[PDB]
Design a protein around this ligand. Sequence first.
Ligand SMILES: CC(C)CCC[C@@H](C)[C@H]1CC[C@H]2[C@@H]3CC=C4C[C@@H](OC(=O)CCC(=O)O)CC[C@]4(C)[C@H]3CC[C@]12C
Ligand SMILES: CC(C)CCC[C@@H](C)[C@H]1CC[C@H]2[C@@H]3CC=C4C[C@@H](OC(=O)CCC(=O)O)CC[C@]4(C)[C@H]3CC[C@]12C
Ligand SMILES: *[C@@H]1O[C@H](CO)[C@@H](O)[C@H](O)[C@H]1NC(C)=O
Ligand SMILES: *[C@@H]1O[C@H](CO)[C@@H](O)[C@H](O)[C@H]1NC(C)=O
Ligand SMILES: N[C@@H](Cn1oc(=O)[nH]c1=O)C(=O)O
Ligand SMILES: N[C@@H](Cn1oc(=O)[nH]c1=O)C(=O)O
Lengths: 764, 764
Amino acid sequence: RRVVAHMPGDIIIGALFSVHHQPTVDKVHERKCGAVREQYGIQRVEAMLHTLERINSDPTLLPNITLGCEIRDSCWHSAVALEQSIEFIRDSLKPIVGVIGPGSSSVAIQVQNLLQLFNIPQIAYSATSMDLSDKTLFKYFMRVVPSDAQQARAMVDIVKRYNWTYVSAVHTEGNYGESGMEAFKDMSAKEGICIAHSYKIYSNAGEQSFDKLLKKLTSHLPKARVVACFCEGMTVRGLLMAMRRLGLAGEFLLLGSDGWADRYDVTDGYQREAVGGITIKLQSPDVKWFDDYYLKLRPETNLRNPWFQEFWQHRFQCRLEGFPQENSKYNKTCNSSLTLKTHHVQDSKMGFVINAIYSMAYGLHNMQMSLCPGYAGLCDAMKPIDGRKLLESLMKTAFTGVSGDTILFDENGDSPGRYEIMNFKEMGKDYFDYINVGSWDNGELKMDDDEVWSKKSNIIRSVCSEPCEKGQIKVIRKGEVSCCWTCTPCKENEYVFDEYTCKACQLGSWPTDDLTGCDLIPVQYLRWGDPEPIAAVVFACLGLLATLFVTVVFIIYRDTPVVKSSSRELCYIILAGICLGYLCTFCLIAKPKQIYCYLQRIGIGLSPAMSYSALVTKTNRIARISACAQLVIAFILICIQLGIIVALFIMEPPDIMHDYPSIREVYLICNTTNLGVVAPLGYNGLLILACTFYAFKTRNVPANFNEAKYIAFAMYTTCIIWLAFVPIYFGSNYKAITMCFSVSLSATVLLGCMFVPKVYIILA
Amino acid sequence: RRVVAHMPGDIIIGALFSVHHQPTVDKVHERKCGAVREQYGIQRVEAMLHTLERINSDPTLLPNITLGCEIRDSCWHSAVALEQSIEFIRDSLKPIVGVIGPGSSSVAIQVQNLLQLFNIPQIAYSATSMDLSDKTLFKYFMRVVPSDAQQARAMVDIVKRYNWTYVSAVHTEGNYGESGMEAFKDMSAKEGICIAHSYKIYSNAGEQSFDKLLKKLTSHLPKARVVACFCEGMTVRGLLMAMRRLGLAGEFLLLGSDGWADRYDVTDGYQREAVGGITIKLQSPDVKWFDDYYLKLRPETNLRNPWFQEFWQHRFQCRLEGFPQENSKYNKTCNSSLTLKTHHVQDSKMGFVINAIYSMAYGLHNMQMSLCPGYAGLCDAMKPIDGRKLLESLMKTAFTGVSGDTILFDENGDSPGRYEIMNFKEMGKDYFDYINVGSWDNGELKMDDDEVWSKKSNIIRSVCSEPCEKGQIKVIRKGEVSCCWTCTPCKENEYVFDEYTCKACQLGSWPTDDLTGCDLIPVQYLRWGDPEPIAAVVFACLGLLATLFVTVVFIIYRDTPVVKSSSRELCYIILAGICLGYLCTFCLIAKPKQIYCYLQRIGIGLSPAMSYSALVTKTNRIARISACAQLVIAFILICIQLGIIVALFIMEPPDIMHDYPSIREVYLICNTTNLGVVAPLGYNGLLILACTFYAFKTRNVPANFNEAKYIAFAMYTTCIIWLAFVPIYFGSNYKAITMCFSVSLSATVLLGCMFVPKVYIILA
Ligand SMILES: CC(C)CCC[C@@H](C)[C@H]1CC[C@H]2[C@@H]3CC=C4C[C@@H](OC(=O)CCC(=O)O)CC[C@]4(C)[C@H]3CC[C@]12C
Ligand SMILES: CC(C)CCC[C@@H](C)[C@H]1CC[C@H]2[C@@H]3CC=C4C[C@@H](OC(=O)CCC(=O)O)CC[C@]4(C)[C@H]3CC[C@]12C
Ligand SMILES: *[C@@H]1O[C@H](CO)[C@@H](O)[C@H](O)[C@H]1NC(C)=O
Ligand SMILES: *[C@@H]1O[C@H](CO)[C@@H](O)[C@H](O)[C@H]1NC(C)=O
Ligand SMILES: N[C@@H](Cn1oc(=O)[nH]c1=O)C(=O)O
Ligand SMILES: N[C@@H](Cn1oc(=O)[nH]c1=O)C(=O)O
């Protein structure tokens, strides 16, 4: 048999209150309800009764109308409340005008599926699930609380604001938890906040199952600190019970929804484990007049509540033997001086309960004012109440409740509301309490951060992978989530193109410090400055000094026989070639200009061509033993090389090319090919070997102060140096400087061992 | 008002059949049902009536018991069937003993929530959703069909077997579609089969919504070919209607669940778009006796079915004016010769309907046999039927139905069943039909693949990312799914370590062809063989020939004055040093052995030390102008270098080190340091310069056939070559061969310009 609270009157308003707990497993089939509760139960029942009394005793709302009610124990279970709603609709086969629908969303849905057949409009006070906005399915559902879509938004705001990224997610099995979790999940997926593993559990579940759940949560412990427990009360309670049963007290943070809102009974005796826990409550002020009424209640007086005796038994663990509930299970007969004000905790959500009953009354008020304005009472139009007419009234109904705030309904029967955020911290010596921290309103999340933790070093932020981008090290996806990643450093060639991808620079470019992108390498020019460059400079300087020295001497001493006898013009050609050879040094060490790159090859070809051509003519003159045709012979042999140079310019212009020894170094050189080097060098070398042969053949002529002898000595050394500097130009990467040394030393040897002895004799 | 089919009798068995369609949007509030159906409707109704007739007319099952029934139109909608079930339980305030519960799972759940309060056991025939296995929530639910957990397994088997990986997923809004999709999703996540984007839609949804859904499916078209439509009939119907309304006829494959099982009406007039489509039906054989009964039905005769007239109206679009349903909406009065056998399509699932009613009867049979065996009929124990006793009977009940198969229930009220797979292909000239392809049973998926497509080139397999592992190119996760990846090639240094990660090899190693891992590089040894190596070999050969030549000559001609005059012993020291210098060539070109690496440095130090030491003593003898102390001087100068070599061996042993010019090439050399090279070379060079000075100072002594003259010439050339081969050893990477050339040519020059002229004179 069932127990029914009821107040008589004209118009009856049903309600479903979770007076008892849900039945446990292996009791759900008998449907025998658990232990009583006040804050979800008796408190709400007395709230309804006294609110109905107030509306009876107010001439403003519904004059000449005595409102009645029927309170049914929902027992928080789906089937139980469904049976109670059947007991409501028994009359529709006094008729109930509408209900103040049950707490949990799943139970609400189950009840409304029945109710909307009989056109009985349901007003919720706690059933916050967002799938109840679908007025196609749920025509008769108007809750005075916001949808938990906003609540999932608030939770995602919190986990963004405190940088939690790799979270665990437990939600209660049932429509509230499931729908709310789905909303939180997709919002988090959008806003880039991953979830380790979504778990689900019944509230009445086994301790074994709770322990399994807790171990599964343990399997993500070092990273997934905070649990996004979009849960309900007994779910969180069972979780904390499991935490103590494994002794994992101050292990990890959890973050609860309004199932855990402000409730002490879910933390009672398990306080040490919900520490630091963050919660979201719907913003409801205290109800002072209800306090005044509720605290003056006595079990000997409150006859009209058939649960009140049993509650009075339970709260004080005592017995009223002389009263209709002995409860022989207990002992220690009740002290007559017991009060409710001792540890009175006012329910959070019961403001909404008063608002809901107000909404029902105001709806009826609007209906009365519409259909029969000039008749205070039940006219002929309201003998049977049209449910749809009542709905039309209720959807348009507005007022201010005990909170004083405007109570209006949108197109979804969802009244707007705020949200408060509590932290469950310590106050003093093991006196733990929730305390208001911040508020959420339409996206606006204001919050006192320093209040949380009482310490600027917070809980370990639930991050799977540390921001390993130290300017260098990239993100490596193993394929788990978009928040778990290993890390690989980019190479010195490799700039961090993106978090995910790291493209290298190309040749001619090099990455910056922080590896954003490419740059340009400080290329080397090697003009005036640097040791080795300037080394050849001083060499060429000494060479040019000796050049001018011997030149002036041989100009002045033209009259002398020892100078006059030999071919002075051919000697002048030698001197000019030698001087141009020294100019080749300064032509090579230059800024990489096009005209310079031209003149380099010009010099390298022509000036040794000049020198060895005039020398081969001299060796011919000294060997064969025309006097004005020797110049013509030299002219021919020079113009061949000049033609070769011009033809090679026709073939390929020596342009200005970036050099790449490796990535780290880039030069800017003349793009003289191997053929362009070797071919004029080949012609020069062949002339060298030719004059070598013709001089070595006739080395035994001691004429003109051993002219041929010194020339043969010069030719020996000359050929040795030319053969020595063969592989060096090919092997080196400093090819220009090698060419400088080679040709400059060649001209040096030629001068020093042809004309310097003659000068030494002519001035000795 | 509502319409009730009923057969009178002793025991009444209720049932919910989807006679009409569901109400459309903006009709769901009036709850006015759509158009009639036979295959889900009238066919099933006649099935129940005739089955009840058979069980009445069978003396075997339940003798002296006239079974009755009440058929209620479910209308496929949740609320409608809920109202009908209220109309069932009106008596419980003839009592219905149990129902043959409605088609869809969501409606089944809604009905059972009501029924289990009144202890009325429900047997389903189509409500395949897996969440109905939870006997905690659903104590009174026994379906004669398997759970769709197996069906999701079958679908995942199919999408594995045909290598579909990147699929789209539409499921019907409602518990069947939702739960089945969840099962398919997590199984696919396990078995590595991704889903593009899960969509959901009501069946009665707007054409706008269908078009939105279709465009959202279009947004994944080139990759996500196959849609895993875990849907229901009208969902698939609306999808095909949208396909024609966008004219996207043969666009993409879909894969349907048993909502789409074998139904023609879901493809009727939209046949061209479900082409190639693959479906899963529960394996049920045809029912011949039902065929015989059903086809002989006449609208003038079938009074007992109050839907049959309206169905007869609908199927032929005609009118029976003289009969209680005129249907003035239609025209074209019915031909009296119309038959049902014209386009008779037998329902698939109605075998299960017959089995379900059989199960109810057999359960009652077991209950009768248990409680009152010796009284054929209703005893005192079965005046009111105990629902729980009936459940206990039904959970243990076994039989063989019209299919002939064993009908047993597990602990979950889920009878085992098979699955058949159809393809919706063409037969001929636009005559389209489903045809059986394969079967699924307990994991065993056998299937005729070649039958599908009639072509070995199938539909484009739904793959987001082609297997770009061509032995070279890796997987790059952009963070979408574990099936969408871009691709990056590994470098030549980089072996494919894994699909996700690609680690390079280290120095001393190199990747293989297919880039599995590292190998060992074929290192170079350069012993006998190769041009440049053997070049120095022939050089040393000619040198040793000349060595022995001059040696034998100076041994024989010891008696001669020109040989006798000079220090023969010191000359012998020169010759020995020179010969050891030639041995240095073959010591350098060797396999990299430790003793060899020792002897290399030994030779390079000592043999030029010997040569230049004996030469400096000779220059001292020839310059200062002791006779047996010259040997002692040479011994001192040699032992200094020998001490240096031994001390350097003490400092660092020249061990055998792998060379790294770059990654691609590795040599195996002696690890002679720069100091270990230069220091003995430094001592040698200082001796060279010393004897150079002492010889150049005294170059003007023409004694002993210009001995000092040729020696000075030798020293000139010697010093030039030593100074020439300075940067080459440092610049080259072929350092050993350079050292060979250098020291061998040095010894060559020394011999050729000291002792060869003396031999030429003594034999001229
Ligand atoms: C003091 C020294 C050891 C260090 C700094 C060397 C340079 C700043 C000087 C010293 C000699 C100079 C050169 C002396 C000879 C002339 C030739 C003459 O004609 C050119 O060859 C034009 C080319 C040019 O503009 O450099 C004037 C420039 C140049 C190269 C001079 C340019 C500047 C040089 C290289
Ligand atoms: C025919 C030629 C141009 C091509 C092939 C050359 C080699 C197969 C031959 C020719 C000369 C040979 C060398 C002649 C001198 C001797 C010295 C003698 O004593 C050693 O120096 C021992 C070292 C060793 O075992 O090689 C015997 C080996 C060796 C190096 C010989 C080894 C094999 C060589 C290099
Ligand atoms: C973490 O939170 C703090 C304060 O909200 C702030 O430094 C920043 O928003 C977050 N840090 C990062 C790296 O996003
Ligand atoms: C694709 O399917 C065929 C036959 O089932 C076969 O080649 C193989 O199983 C699949 N291919 C790959 C690459 O897995
Ligand atoms: N918010 C809830 C109900 N609720 O469950 C609890 O345990 N507390 C509480 O407020 C829902 O919408 O179903
Ligand atoms: N399998 C279904 C029911 N069903 O819906 C259809 O459209 N066809 C069909 O068989 C379910 O389990 O709910």
